[PDB]
Each structure stands twice: as C-alpha cells, then as structure tokens.
Design a protein. Sequence first.
Length: 12
Amino acid sequence: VQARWEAAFDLD
C-alpha cells in the first residue's frame, strides 16, 4: 500500500 502512512498495510 504505502505503509509508514495513514496507518500501515503490507510494508508497515
């Protein structure tokens, strides 16, 4: 997704 972002997804 983006991670380090709105929350975190697949990189988190």
